Design an enzyme around this catalytic site. Structure first.
Site, PDB file in Angstrom:
ATOM      1  N   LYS B  72     -69.911  37.054   1.525  1.00 22.04           N
ATOM      2  CA  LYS B  72     -70.243  38.338   2.142  1.00 22.04           C
ATOM      3  C   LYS B  72     -69.696  39.413   1.211  1.00 22.04           C
ATOM      4  CE  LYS B  72     -68.036  40.123   5.658  1.00 22.04           C
ATOM      5  NZ  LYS B  72     -67.621  40.325   7.095  1.00 22.04           N
ATOM      6  N   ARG B 116     -70.209  39.015  14.414  1.00 16.95           N
ATOM      7  CA  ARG B 116     -69.267  37.868  14.348  1.00 16.95           C
ATOM      8  C   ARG B 116     -67.857  38.269  14.781  1.00 16.95           C
ATOM      9  NH1 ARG B 116     -64.742  39.167  10.647  1.00 16.95           N
ATOM     10  NH2 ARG B 116     -65.450  38.603   8.520  1.00 16.95           N
ATOM     11  N   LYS B 236     -45.383  47.303  15.910  1.00 13.39           N
ATOM     12  CA  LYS B 236     -44.714  46.032  15.560  1.00 13.39           C
ATOM     13  C   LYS B 236     -44.028  45.356  16.743  1.00 13.39           C
ATOM     14  CE  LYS B 236     -42.312  45.785  11.629  1.00 13.39           C
ATOM     15  NZ  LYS B 236     -41.042  46.371  11.102  1.00 13.39           N
TER      16      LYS B 236
END
EC number: 1.5.1.51
Lengths: 330, 330
Positions: B72, B116, B236
């Site tokens: 891709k 996808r 985080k």
């Protein structure tokens, strides 16, 4: 509309891709941009499912007044000619407008690839071969050898003899026969071994698919230029004994661990020992051949900017001649 | 003859690429092959001439009964929608027959890419979201957000409300208006800030283009599943506080230095702390959601095998329906 131009091999040929000049011109510009570091060229990722069985992604951007981006997606199966009667290499080049990053062209890659690699030899020879050289040596009679020969003959009209070896003696005989007919005044000589072929060449070009070196330093005539296009053909001593070693890109050659990197990692070569990058010869930054006894080795990794530059030159010629198939993206 | 099939976006849609099922089916197989390590997927080289302005080469091979290779080649210009009225992302996927390594298809990539990525969320949600969840949150109203929403709605008919935020309030309003008409029974709610949107979602999907995190751990409802498709959106602390962290590929996430690698390099996360790779959930190797209070984070790098698998599924459907343009390579 978002459109792209599709150029198959026939269109590429129709647009000038069947002769060397377009590649020489494209690569002169690209090598100039390379020497000015106006490009970006990521490491090529290899897709292995032989060192020859793989598909390689070769992306690059060439900056400059007419900047272009793109990728060469090129594969090989050692087996294709022998088992399947297909060419070993195959691929596509996609070009991209750096303004939008949109793809603008889809092109057949294998002809362009082999032609640009031959133009590498041409340009290097213009700088590194003895002027007026009469004897050319081709080792390997595949499509690489074929484009290398075609391009040298187009670019150097003083070539009088061509020494030819392929370890598959049959491939050698067919290659010599066709070329002897193509160019009747030139003596093509099929040699009994690689040593005979290499020993006779003022310019030696390696176009094989082995990964074991056989070329020895003392086969080399004084004044020889060797364009080591297939990389692994040349013994390590040659790198150590040549008067000048030229590469296309130092950082690529010095990746872990190609032949030059192995030499660096022991104490046997360094960026200091390297005479030039090719682009530096093109720009007149660093001298080329300086006398006729120098034995000179070019060891090119092969670079994406060469493919994309060439493809781009050809795309513009195609657009100008209304060649190719217009595709819609959407 | 060496031929290839060209499939533009219209053909891809005609061949089933406009709905999620084909992607769910393709990715289930690819993720299964991934969990069995029957693939090869080199590091993706980025071509930067914004962290968004680049062209990425994504090569892979998927092994198995129906093996396929391809790449891709997908780019983005942050600027395209705003300055040029073009989509941000664009690209091509090339497919290759692993027998010969020859290219066999050239396809438009951007629809396939976004579909996808939505199927990633679908499959993860089937394993990690609370069963029967009613509230979905989309952050970011671009084409990624759009395919994420379309696919969730196709795959989960119990969704009753969709909370929507885009920092460009205008993009949010247009997105909600169109979807409200597309699905009149579902309540689409445009929220005043990201906190409101995230706080309300039983499934939260991040589809933005920033590289600064704003999602805080305590915005997250107990029992939430967050599919962090745009990567940098999540603080985080979320990685540290979630009950389960799932990735697509550990080695990719732990490259130097993405958020997870930074966490590992300090003493705050390790492969030991990771609950699963996605493929491992697909194979039934490792359990998914285990209770309804668990807060679960998926952090997918994005993987080439997903694109190539999807494209390959679609290629075969196209071939079966005589869709697309046959090109000659030579």
């Amino acid at each position: 509309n978002r459109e792209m131009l599709y150029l198959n091999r026939s269109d590429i040929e129709q647009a000038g891709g069947n002769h060397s000049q377009v590649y020489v011109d494209a690569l002169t510009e690209a090598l100039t941009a390379h020497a000015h570091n106006d490009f970006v060229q990521p490491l090529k990722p290899y897709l292995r499912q032989h060192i020859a069985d793989r598909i390689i992604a070769m992306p690059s951007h060439i900056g400059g007044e007419h900047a272009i981006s793109g990728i060469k997606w090129i594969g090989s199966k050692h087996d294709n000619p022998s088992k399947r009667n297909m060419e070993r290499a195959s691929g596509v080049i996609i070009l991209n407008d750096p303004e939008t990053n949109y793809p603008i062209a889809v092109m057949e890659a294998s002809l362009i690839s082999s032609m640009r690699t031959a133009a590498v030899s041409v340009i290097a020879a213009k700088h590194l071969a003895k002027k007026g050289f009469k004897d050319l040596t081709i080792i390997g009679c595949g499509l690489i050898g074929d484009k290398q020969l075609q391009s040298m003959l187009e670019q150097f009209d003083h070539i009088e003899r061509v020494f030819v070896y392929d370890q598959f003696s049959e491939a050698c005989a067919r290659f010599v026969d066709r070329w002897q007919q193509q160019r009747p005044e030139i003596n093509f000589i099929a040699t009994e071994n690689a040593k005979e072929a290499v020993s006779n060449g003022e310019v030696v070009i390696t176009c094989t698919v082995t990964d074991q070196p056989y070329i020895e330093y003392d086969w080399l005539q004084k004044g020889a230029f060797i364009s080591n296009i297939s990389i692994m053909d040349v013994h390590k001593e040659v790198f150590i004994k040549a008067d000048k070693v030229v590469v296309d890109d130092w950082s690529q050659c010095n990746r872990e661990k190609k032949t030059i990197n192995q030499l660096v990692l022991e104490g046997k070569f360094s960026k200091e020992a390297l005479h030039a990058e090719l682009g530096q010869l093109v720009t007149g930054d660093i001298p080329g051949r300086e006398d006729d006894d120098e034995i000179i080795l070019l060891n090119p990794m092969g670079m994406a900017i060469e493919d994309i530059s060439s493809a781009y030159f050809i795309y513009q010629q195609a657009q100008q001649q209304n060649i190719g198939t217009t595709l819609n993206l959407y």
